Design a protein around this ligand. Structure first.
Ligand SMILES: [Cl-]
Ligand SMILES: [Cl-]
Ligand SMILES: [Cl-]
Length: 163
């Protein structure tokens, strides 16, 4: 547990994170994928041994002693808005269980289902609110990683709003 558990946001590649573990925005088949998933594959390829897991779940695989939590958000191209929302909330709840089980003091996390799984919609607020619902009861320092300058400002505002 962190002495004063916090949320922060950084605009940079999550493969360069300064946290005790990382959450991959994984596909269900444990494939290298694109975006965050391909950066994670290049940095921690050993963590993709038996990383396949269903939508709405998280599966942790160690790269050395460094934990990679593979979290599979829904692809909103394939899911209804209702069932996709349920699966996206569930994936973050499994991330909070894994972060707790590992006993880490810090975790690097991307916004699940906001890139090529977004079904072409802006899901910043939907994804970030499910992240908060899951992670608020954990005592890890959470550092959210993003790539877009306007998203950084909006995530930072949402964090500061709760204080
Ligand atoms: Cl970078
Ligand atoms: Cl995505
Ligand atoms: Cl982004």
């Amino acid at each position: 547990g962190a002495m004063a558990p916090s949320y922060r946001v950084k605009r940079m590649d999550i493969a360069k994170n300064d946290e005790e573990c990382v959450v991959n925005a994984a596909n269900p088949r444990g494939l290298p994928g694109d975006g965050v998933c391909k950066a994670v594959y290049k940095k921690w390829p050993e963590s993709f041994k038996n990383s396949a897991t269903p939508v709405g779940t998280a599966k942790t695989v160690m790269c050395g002693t460094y934990p990679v939590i593979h979290a599979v958000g829904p692809n909103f191209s394939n899911y209804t808005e209702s069932e996709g929302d349920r699966e996206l909330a569930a994936a973050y709840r499994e991330v909070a269980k894994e972060v707790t089980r590992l006993g880490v003091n810090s975790v690097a996390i991307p916004l699940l289902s906001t890139g090529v799984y977004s079904g072409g919609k802006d899901r910043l607020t939907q994804s970030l609110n499910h992240l908060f619902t899951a992670m608020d009861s954990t005592d890890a320092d959470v550092v959210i990683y993003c790539r877009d300058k306007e998203w950084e400002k909006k995530i930072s505002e949402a964090i500061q709003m709760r204080t």
